[PDB]
Design a protein around this ligand. Sequence first.
Ligand SMILES: CC(C)Oc1ccc(-c2ncc(CNc3ccnc(C(F)(F)F)c3)s2)cc1Cl
Length: 206
Amino acid sequence: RNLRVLLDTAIPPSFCDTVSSVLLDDFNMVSLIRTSPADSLATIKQDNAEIDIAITIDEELKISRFNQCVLGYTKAFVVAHPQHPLCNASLHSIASLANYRQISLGSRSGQHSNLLRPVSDKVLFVENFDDMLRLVEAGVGWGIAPHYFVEERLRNGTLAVLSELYEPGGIDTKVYCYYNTALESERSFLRFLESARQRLRELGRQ
Ligand SMILES: CC(C)Oc1ccc(-c2ncc(CNc3ccnc(C(F)(F)F)c3)s2)cc1Cl
């Protein structure tokens, strides 16, 4: 119960804090680590890190030494500069964006999971969301960003949304919890899962 825990940058801060409080309520030593989802699954896989619990959106069912569960959901938007070509065109489609350039997270130096795989042939990789939104806000391209990162810049006109046809409201991605196999038998972990999940649901509806 000396715990190392990972959360990705798509996890809303309210989400990570909701988790933290519970973790400390049921494990008394909790160390928190943050990474962008592209590097999330890789980090836990490197055994030199000793991550016991990881909360991310990238999935691989062949993860060794780790089991899986769903902890809740988060939302994401296809955002782009207000004067971007697509923004003008009101009919946006998965093909229509394959032509224009995508600012995307991660590195070409890695197994691009389907979830974080670039959908377009013309791409530019960045390493965090701040650099993604800097480029997108300069018309470089379009991107897929979490809610908490962009919400304000869209209610402010700084940015726009092209995802209001595909999934009106945001692209509901699942948020996964990866427990080290060993932790399955510790009543602390299971109580964490219960209390956290409830709290997350309660916050989500609001
Ligand atoms: C606009 C529409 C017509 O076309 C699309 C429809 C669906 C998609 C999705 N792509 C990744 C999906 C999973 N969720 C992700 C993936 C990566 N990154 C995040 C982050 F956390 F960063 F927000 C969340 S859904 C893309 C496009 Cl372009």
